[PDB]
Target: Pyruvate kinase isozymes M1/M2
Amino acid sequence: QTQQLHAAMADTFLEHMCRLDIDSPPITARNTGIICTIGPASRSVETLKEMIKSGMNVARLNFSHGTHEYHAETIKNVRTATESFASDPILYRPVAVALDTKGPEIRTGLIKGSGTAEVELKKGATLKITLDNAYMEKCDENILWLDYKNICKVVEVGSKIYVDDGLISLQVKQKGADFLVTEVENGGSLGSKKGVNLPGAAVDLPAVSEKDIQDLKFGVEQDVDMVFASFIRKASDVHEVRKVLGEKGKNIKIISKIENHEGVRRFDEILEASDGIMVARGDLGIEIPAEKVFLAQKMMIGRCNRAGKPVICATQMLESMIKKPRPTRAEGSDVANAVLDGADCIMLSGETAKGDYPLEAVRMQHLIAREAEAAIYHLQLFEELRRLAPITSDPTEATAVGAVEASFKCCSGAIIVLTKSGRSAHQVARYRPRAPIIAVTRNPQTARQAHLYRGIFPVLCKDPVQEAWAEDVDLRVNFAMNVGKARGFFKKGDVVIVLTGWRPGSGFTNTMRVVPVP
Amino acid sequence: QTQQLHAAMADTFLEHMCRLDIDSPPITARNTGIICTIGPASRSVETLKEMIKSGMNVARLNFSHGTHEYHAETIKNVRTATESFASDPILYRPVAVALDTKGPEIRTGLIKGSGTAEVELKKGATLKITLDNAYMEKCDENILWLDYKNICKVVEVGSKIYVDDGLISLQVKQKGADFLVTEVENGGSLGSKKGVNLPGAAVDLPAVSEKDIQDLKFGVEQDVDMVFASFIRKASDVHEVRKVLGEKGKNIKIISKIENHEGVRRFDEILEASDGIMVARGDLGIEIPAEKVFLAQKMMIGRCNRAGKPVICATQMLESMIKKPRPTRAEGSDVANAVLDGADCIMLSGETAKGDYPLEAVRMQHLIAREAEAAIYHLQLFEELRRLAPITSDPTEATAVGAVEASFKCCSGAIIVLTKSGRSAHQVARYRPRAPIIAVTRNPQTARQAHLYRGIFPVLCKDPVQEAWAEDVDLRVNFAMNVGKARGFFKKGDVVIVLTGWRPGSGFTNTMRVVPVP
Amino acid sequence: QTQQLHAAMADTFLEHMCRLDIDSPPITARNTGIICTIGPASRSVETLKEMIKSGMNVARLNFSHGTHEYHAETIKNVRTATESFASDPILYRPVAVALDTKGPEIRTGLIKGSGTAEVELKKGATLKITLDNAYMEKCDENILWLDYKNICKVVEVGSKIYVDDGLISLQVKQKGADFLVTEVENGGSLGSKKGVNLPGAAVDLPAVSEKDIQDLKFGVEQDVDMVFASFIRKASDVHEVRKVLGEKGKNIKIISKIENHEGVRRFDEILEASDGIMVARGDLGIEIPAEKVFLAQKMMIGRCNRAGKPVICATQMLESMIKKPRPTRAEGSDVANAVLDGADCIMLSGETAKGDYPLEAVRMQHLIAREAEAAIYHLQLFEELRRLAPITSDPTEATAVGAVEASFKCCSGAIIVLTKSGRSAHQVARYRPRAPIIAVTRNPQTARQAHLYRGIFPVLCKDPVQEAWAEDVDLRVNFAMNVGKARGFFKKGDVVIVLTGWRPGSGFTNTMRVVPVP
Model:
């Protein structure tokens, strides 16, 4: 068989594993979204044109570096590249723009005047941390200054302090008002203005820094689709971002980045306040012991799936491809297991931003995701998702499961959904069908934001709005039939599911039709 | 909560049993069809009017006794009573007519001329079986004659023979040409030309006798709805009954009655040729050990649910109500458990034909069915039915499940199906929703025939066909809405599932809708 | 194949039903205990000998009628009949003695003076309840007297009153101090000294009546094994029964008869307090709608399986066998379904007390049980029961689950349990093994009380205790081996599970051995 359908028919997960077949080829549609961060290696319009072809869905801009002019040109370049396919709206793939904030961080000062001076400190020694702004310009192996003036209020005696992405470890021996007496646990080459992390601490830094405010305005005026909000650690953080975007940015999706102990603890309140989640494994593994990261990933993916909210797996997924044309076996495993856990989207950061093989990384991401989507045990997944979802009076929700159930029964080529806000497509995607979801919309912003959801293959309709409702439906349905055929998702004669509303939107989606492809 | 909905959500069959609540009231909608046998007690037109008001769906006419004219007035009486209610199509309830044949039967010879004298037979004594036709009128307690010519070819030395519905047990000790020396294992009262039974033997009697031919032909010309074919043991037997019915009996449904060891062993091929099955417990209990009957009963119901074909639980259901005005506790258990096994229909042989209490027998039958229907573990039943059924390319099959799933999701008040031949409704029923299936049809036989399937509430539309397709759909859907409200299945504001086609044809049901009741 | 091993390997319950084979003979052992009501038809020793041969395990005594000398003679005969097999302790079947109390009851007064006097009663006519003792002997069609003087305190406006085993229905219109104005809802033949039932009411009669206290004391000195305590509606009732039995009868097991709405509604607290349960279907069907009994039955059986406490299914099991030598189809299904539900014990009330065919009923009870035991879906039953039972620290409990698991793995001939108190064998029995549990005990009361449990085939070891520990273990083990071989449970070479202690006398049945039959 194809697309692992022999494995799909097992009544046991162990047997499902036993039946996984390398000679069973997947179908051509790929459900998992691919976020690519844009930088010096992939900024040009020529490269981005080829990057959309290779399967990029969302462009990510990391605002830890680069000016507004630099980023605005990148967005102009993404748009030029994206709209270069617009000529044929049949083959047009919408591309989302994501703004990823710097967020609140903690830095150190310069060492003995200069900012490139390094001072080694031995393992087991003693070290003083100060808030005294006089040591801003000259740090030492005895005295270190940081720019976070509430450090003593949140950190007890016996607590650890990670310096320079977890290179140096430091136990606190004495508290006080404006100083900490510390003992070195790890040690190494200590440089100037390095990052500081406080594991297991309830850091009281503001949700959005001074720079964030500026960047969030910049995003609103640049018409971005989503904000990846750094260092989120409570519900009030998300609401702070919500309030700062205000009225003009109300339709922009907020994705909360969980990158610390507290974020994980208060996950349930963060998720209900957010539009979606990002498992920021890079910073997470600095904050919590690295060996616990997968536990957090599986928990966060589990709940986002249960809540029907988008989740993104991020960082180091194809890390070696920065320098080399092919990934390690660990990396291949990682991408496949993110998909198998239930990640809506997977990310590349540096692999495409700075690295030597940005295109090959996107291509590899595409190949694996595809293989992993067939390898999913849909039998267990659907039963579990449909029983953990409450009985509701919502007709759109009842129509949604009906479509997915039908989808499985007839091994459908696609689930076609007419939607303007995206909700109708999101409600299907929540139940995780094998069949791709071709989501037809006239709203450009909706089309771009749909990429956050697995299975949703968004298409933008250009055709003018017609007077008779039945004809406006058929126009959009037939357009979707023309997409599937062109992209080889299905051919004439194949069976598809079609979801429509009874009156012109939005939230009237109450009709499922099982139709052959014209 | 109502209709055992607290038990319905248990993740385990045991917990489902623990949650069964006598204080949880069922819905008014009853799903399991009731077949009544019409005889001396229920022949009256006054009686049939109130029996329709109780919950009779199928009228059984036993052609083991009574001439053609005797049963001819019966059909006319049922049709008179039914059409009395036809004054209001909203309240009108279709009543089907069945025909139970006599089939092949082995009888003994007369004793001492007149069949009134009694003969005694002792246990441990010997008795010879002879084929010589000179012993017809002279059957002793030392010699016995029976009209079955091939009794020596099928009976090995050591087999059992039963006389008069299992009263006298006989074990063979000698093989011969015309003689068989046989020892008595039970013995007792011995009447004239009594019923003979051959347990565990492939009896090669003709599938139908010339008496059965005239009954079947009489059925065709009286426009009956179904036939209960007696004594079926192989697939060819079912083909034989179909031959008699012919082209003019193409629509009449054949129900094969299983009542011997061979029929059970070769059940698969029988069900294949049959339109339905009847678990003939009365005659079966005589053939096979009576403690093994529940096994065959459950085996057959299981296989009929898996194949999606109607099955009837039969005989001695409410045995005590033949004299008493209330059933025993074992009888209540029996009705409930047959419904719990998955029987589409349950029936009363004698309770409605001869008994002192025929009217209330249906009421008790109707009261238990509703309660047992609620107590079904739908979560297990549905997931098992939908995975034993394969992946289909047929759009209507995919529509059926989606509707059933949607039905569960919004706890639908009903599944309305616009059907012509009934096939659309039949496809919903085989997935056993809890929500009643309202089948809207203009075909009067489709209406009557639909009572064979669980949960189908047939309604006959007397309105003329509208010039436009969409208008005729609405008229028929709105008709179902009026029916369900009047019968108290649901009210204004409730949510229902609607199944219609795309064009004024027949088979192609593809559109599922989730609509509120106007 | 044998004992539905083909069905037992089904990965689904629907397929398990489809695989039930009538040609698959059951194992020689029977696991369901059988209680028989000894009375006029079975009072004689010669009849009681053959009842133990047919397979009766417990002797019920109904103290609703008869005197102490009548019942002491009945126990005397039962005990001497049991001892007619005591000479060979390989074939010796322990037989338990059971006392079923009358309980508290509400009775009407004498009509028109005489005992047998008839008064007809119109539907809709008016009737008056009174507690005035002057009316005691002149109950008319206008005036009716009851001996329950707290009647008005437990009945509100609109409550029902049933008279004479639910023959007469009355609705309360006017309340008062000691009078109730009732409207007749049903009616018929009204006479003197007739039982009254209170549906949906908290009846505040004493837990044990003045007669019952003496009956229980009688039981203690007569040395009974159990008590079927009538009309238990709360936990406080079970304590009252325990209080009457006191120290001299602290070992006598209390089986609580649930027979009204309140008993069902407060079942949890009753089960906790009680040792066992009896689904008293007769009185339940009068108190609650007859169609609702199966709901209560399955509820209670499930809860008793979840709690691991004995449960008994009662009344009208084989009701037609009082006058006939064979059971009806509805009855054969009742027994089977009771076993499949998970009932520990089944009983016969009147079928063995007043009927003409008592032995045949017991043999039928025995035949249906063994068949229905093989048709259990053990894969589901074992994996639900083990999941619903909480994690323990008790080794005696942990060894049983493992021993049951071992039994399913090696398809064990039996599980042999050496137990002083019976507790060990009880702990095995709750996980419903397919293999017969041979409980070897030197304690005669342990031997008798063991019958309340499914699977446990008890054997009373009469050999003297040997000085060394190792000698004594094998002596009891080999004794059970001889029992199994002789009764035909297994042959030499077959695999058995053995459950014993390790240390001589530090308690704990903690050792599981897998051994061949020598």
In short: The radius of gyration of chain C is 25 Å. The interface with chain A takes residues 11-12 of chain C (CB under 8 Å).
